[PDB]
């Protein structure tokens, strides 16, 4: 009898949380890096056939790259937003860039300033949604190609 070299100490792996891929914010690949295991296209299709929808959403959104992003309700875009630099005692606010003009160009509180010092008044109408970070990455890669994606939010 031969004792083979496929021992169970070199095959088991478990992750609760840990490192994530920087550009997708999804679990890393591999065992020695303490990554995740891929639920692939075929597994997803199997999960659809059962009709277990929340299982599919948990194994493809909730526990992989669920992010509480911000999207401009007026603009309809995800990655054009930005936090406003606070003044003394102020509270930082989420505000749009595409839907905002310079307060300098147009001739109280609806004026926000970015870090460089410019003063804006404009698209202060951004909400928070629940999207995968791969959505933001895809949006960036499409915008770099000259394509815009308007996202319609249910409450407007």
């Amino acid at each position: 009898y031969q004792r083979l070299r496929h021992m169970v100490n070199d095959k088991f792996q478990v992750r609760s949380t840990g490192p994530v891929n920087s550009l997708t914010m999804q679990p890393v690949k591999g065992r020695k890096r303490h990554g995740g295991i891929r639920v692939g296209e075929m597994e997803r299709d199997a999960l659809i056939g059962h009709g277990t929808s929340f299982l599919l959403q948990d194994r493809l959104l909730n526990s992989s790259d669920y992010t509480q992003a911000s999207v401009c309700r007026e603009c309809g875009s995800i990655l054009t937003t930005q936090q406003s630099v606070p003044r003394i005692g102020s509270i930082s606010t989420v505000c749009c860039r595409r839907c905002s003009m310079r307060f300098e160009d147009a001739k109280d509180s609806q004026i926000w300033e970015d870090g460089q010092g410019n003063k804006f008044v404009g698209g202060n109408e951004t909400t928070t949604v629940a999207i995968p970070f791969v959505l933001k990455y895809l949006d960036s890669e499409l915008s770099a190609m000259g394509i815009r994606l308007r996202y319609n939010v249910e409450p407007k």
Binding site: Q57, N62, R87, I88, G89, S90, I91, D108, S109, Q110, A130, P155
Partner: protein
Amino acid sequence: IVRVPIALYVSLAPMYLENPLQGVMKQHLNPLVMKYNNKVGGVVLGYEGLKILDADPLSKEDTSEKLIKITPDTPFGFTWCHVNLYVWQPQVGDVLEGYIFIQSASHIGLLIHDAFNASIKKNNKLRFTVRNVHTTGRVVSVDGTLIS
């Protein structure tokens, strides 16, 4: 002092599923009282006529039982609601009656309306005009200008 009926889309806590009126008021209205809200601006004070909408289209009114729509991800439910804000509105150029709390040579430390902070700057009962309004600061406040 004006009344502004507004429609808001406020989330509901599962803990208040047996008292939705209080679950909306104590969760979205009290955090708005005495605060500069970007729809009126003055010290919000009063939440009269809070009416919870119903997600049932064929819902005759006056009913004491209402539907709340549940988000597919979390137990918290969302809905539309209607309520008259009933809020003050001081702005630029309005007569304001105030009092002086502590006199300072550089920035007078005074609480207008017996409760609301303010200050008097350098280059600037009594019915004084208003130049601007300070709401990005710690509290609701307004500086004093005495040019006429």
